Amino acid sequence: EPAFNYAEALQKSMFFYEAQRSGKLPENNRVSWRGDSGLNDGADVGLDLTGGWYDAGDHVKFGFPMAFTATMLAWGAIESPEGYIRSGQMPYLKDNLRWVNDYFIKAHPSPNVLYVQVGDGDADHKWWGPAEVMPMERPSFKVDPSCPGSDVAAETAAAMAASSIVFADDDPAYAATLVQHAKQLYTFADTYRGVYSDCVPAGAFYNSWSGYQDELVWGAYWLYKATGDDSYLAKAEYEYDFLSTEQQTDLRSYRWTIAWDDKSYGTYVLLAKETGKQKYIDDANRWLDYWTVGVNGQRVPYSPGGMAVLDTWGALRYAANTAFVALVYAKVIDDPVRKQRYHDFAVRQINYALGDNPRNSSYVVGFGNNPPRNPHHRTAHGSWTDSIASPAENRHVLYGALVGGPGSPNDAYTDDRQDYVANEVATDYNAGFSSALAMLVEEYGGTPLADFPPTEEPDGPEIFVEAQINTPGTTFTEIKAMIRNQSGWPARMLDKGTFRYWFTLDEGVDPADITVSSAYNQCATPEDVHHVSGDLYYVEIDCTGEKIFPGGQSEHRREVQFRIAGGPGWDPSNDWSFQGIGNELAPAPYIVLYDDGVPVWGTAP
Ligand SMILES: [Ca+2]
Ligand SMILES: [Ca+2]
């Protein structure tokens, strides 16, 4: 039966994409530790560019890999709708695709204008904290006739074209809108030629190494499938002859694999599947042979554990991408030997990622045996001090994320959040992987978990007040209060906070004689005290205007030292807020914190 529960893995992969969402989240949000974020995206250009997915463990919205991710997910859903239907994940796949496509629509204000990036890679990567409280500015970047991007435009066109097929039967109106956008985007890409990275500051992250030739063949094919317009298939087969050859021969590239950059490999198979021409079959075969048996003595590096290691970065992502295409190809080819070779290779690579390896551990967060616990992801970590080192363990479980894994062919791996190689996570990492899982569910089955996602509970008070006696006295009480915002369910801002300290007026003390002073207060220092009833009074500290958020050592807290002097007769033992306050800084349950007038911590008299 299933060696691993492929349905559960796919179920968790869909949750991962939901955790990567940007913009205003829906009522039905399943990720309780995620809230609204990136709400002012596009503001700098007068457009609403909210929505879409955060690329990896950061908060930049990189259009090139985001679009590729969409095309791959749609492809898997087209190949194996049954896998998604049986795992009960089809509605989640559609919800994820609609989320990203709704953004592509927003990002395409007019036929030849495509916004391909929101956020600056360097400014974004300098800060380590939750998406909900990002403090930096997020610029919008685009490509147009003046500075084109055939690669990213053609990819987005393919993503929308491929997605339309998925929605065709459900929402024919939406499917039509997607196809219309895809057509315009492809014309733009075909007419105004250029590499997008020459126009937007994405070179250091997602540089178009292969160029755009591969995206022109890839986009044309998908448009053919979405429209049925023969001209597109003609266009694909024409552009195909200009694909990159390798080193010294006329053999088309067969030593790498399909990913966000080079789609050559996918077209080999897609066209072979579509036309049946020996031309495509020869290329597809050479490539898949290099990954399995080798061609001319050369073969992709293999670990003793049986993992295909193509490169240091996203090793598992690469193996997973190849595994998916191998499964698609294995169905079209007639040769029984090649069919078995490719199919078995695919299953072996996915199984390795799910736990069938020398470490006996899953490489999918929150899944299987001994999974990674500390993926390199800002929001999942939940740091409130702008530090990748604290807290030690991630505060949230990023269910479903496939990590980079072993970067070398030695099966070695250490679950370290600071290791951006082994523990990196990203939308494209789960694309081919998910599609492969859909195929495997259809073939081997598996059952999804009835109660998923689990509801996480906070690791402590999120927003609270700590206090301690600063200086002992008899005619006064001097408190050292600390307001803390270490929220993570979800991380939130506290910019309208005030707190009250209640006390009981004592015999012989005139309230007109009570003074509240401070030698250090990050908030306001009040002149009066407030009378409730009888001899119950309170001092109110006003911190409104102060942005207290989990985004740094100074940002997450406000220190407030305050002395309430009442003169002889002052007696704190009958003061409500005084209960439990000692000489060590600790949570003060009787000091109440208000967020715009609404109690958030402590209990009042
Ligand atoms: Ca390319
Ligand atoms: Ca008193």
From Swiss-Prot:
Domain of life: Bacteria
This protein's UniProt keywords: Carbohydrate metabolism, Cellulose degradation, Glycosidase, Hydrolase, Polysaccharide degradation, Signal
GO MF terms, alphabetically ordered: cellulase activity; cellulose binding
GO BP term, pick one: cellulose catabolic process
EC number(s) given by UniProt: 3.2.1.4
UniProt keyword Signal, yes or no: yes
TM stretches of this protein: none
Chain ranges of the CBM3 domain: 458-605
Record: active site: D58 (nucleophile), H376, H381, D415, E424
Record pathway: Glycan metabolism; cellulose degradation
Catalytic activity: Endohydrolysis of (1->4)-beta-D-glucosidic linkages in cellulose, lichenin and cereal beta-D-glucans
Stated family: Belongs to the glycosyl hydrolase 9 (cellulase E) family.
Protein's UniProt name: Endoglucanase E-4
